[PDB]
């Protein structure tokens, strides 16, 4: 998200983060965005939720299409540029890059893809820039009459119009099955010497907490008296019993 660079216009780039712990409210708690759209869930309330992975479409656009790239939308994209699953499960956040995607004097790279004859399956990546043909005769690898580029230019300037304005765009459809990344766990300090209804290292129960003289094994978390009834708790963390 704080990522400096997103993909080119025609090359929406997929990114995943997994096999770690993510704090999702701080990502929600940034307010630096002209776009914060989460569907199915809020940008918050994911810290108690663990997911296997999420895929982020990365690219550089103009502000007019901060709307145009999203599931459930219809238009030139849904027919000619980009189709997304009808059962999208995720979120779309984006933030403006109006002064941030054009280079001084004009980035002498600027080219732009909107349209392309082809067709799009849900969540499909297309980059082709070929001259558009509606059928009169083979172009024979030649542009000109009835062989015309289906991709107007945005043409980004530092003073880009709002429709023209570059925006940092992230399209998130969440993948879950073996979830890896949730909030931190929530959690508190470590306190002792009081009869408490506890959550011990995810083990929910009750009792008075006091220091243990018992010798636990390095992985050993808990001990249960006969009948499988807890007897001591290892600090999950400082591994102190």
């Amino acid at each position, epitope marked *: 998200f704080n990522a400096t660079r997103f993909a080119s216009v025609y090359a929406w780039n997929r990114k995943r983060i997994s096999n770690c712990v993510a704090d999702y409210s701080v990502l929600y708690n940034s307010a630096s965005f002209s776009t914060f759209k989460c569907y199915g869930v809020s940008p918050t309330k994911l810290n108690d939720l663990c997911f296997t992975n999420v895929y982020a479409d990365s690219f550089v656009i103009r502000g007019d299409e901060v709307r145009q790239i999203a599931p459930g939308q219809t238009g030139k994209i849904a027919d000619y540029n980009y189709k997304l699953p009808d059962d999208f499960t995720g979120c779309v956040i984006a933030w403006n890059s109006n002064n941030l995607d054009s280079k001084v004097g004009g*980035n*002498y790279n600027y080219l*732009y893809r909107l349209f392309r004859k082809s067709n799009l399956k849900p969540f499909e990546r297309d980059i082709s820039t070929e001259i558009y043909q509606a059928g009169s005769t083979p172009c024979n*690898g030649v542009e000109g009459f009835n062989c015309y*580029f289906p991709l*107007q230019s945005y043409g980004f300037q530092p003073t880009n119009g709002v429709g023209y304005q570059p925006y940092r765009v992230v399209v998130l459809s969440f993948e879950l099955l073996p979830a890896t990344v949730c909030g931190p766990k929530k959690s508190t300090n470590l306190v002792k010497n009081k009869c408490v209804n506890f959550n011990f290292n995810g083990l929910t129960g009750t009792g008075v907490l006091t220091e243990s003289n018992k010798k636990f094994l390095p992985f050993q978390q808990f001990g249960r008296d006969i009948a499988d009834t807890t007897d001591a708790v290892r600090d999950p963390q400082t591994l102190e019993i």
Partner: nanobody
Amino acid sequence: QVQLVESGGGSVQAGGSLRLSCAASGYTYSTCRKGWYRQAPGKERELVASITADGATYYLDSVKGRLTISQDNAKNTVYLQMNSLKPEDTAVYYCAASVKDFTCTFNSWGQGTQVTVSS
């Protein structure tokens, strides 16, 4: 308008190196993408390499590693350094310059320079 002129083509034995030069003239501020196209005899035009203003570059799998595309902003020229040339590389190479304002095509094309690699 923008003017593209190619130079540096010629005949080279297989395994040699060639550097093609494309000098842009006119309204340079309008040019956006610069890349090299080649059209081997009997084949269609293909994108060999393209470079972004920021410096981002991409190459076709056939030429990747052997060919490098760079720019000289002061010279207003883009170069195609061809190393370890193969007879397959023989074709007419076109410098292509995109126009910024326009449907971002390769609005400007060069005359094209023929590079022949002997075996």
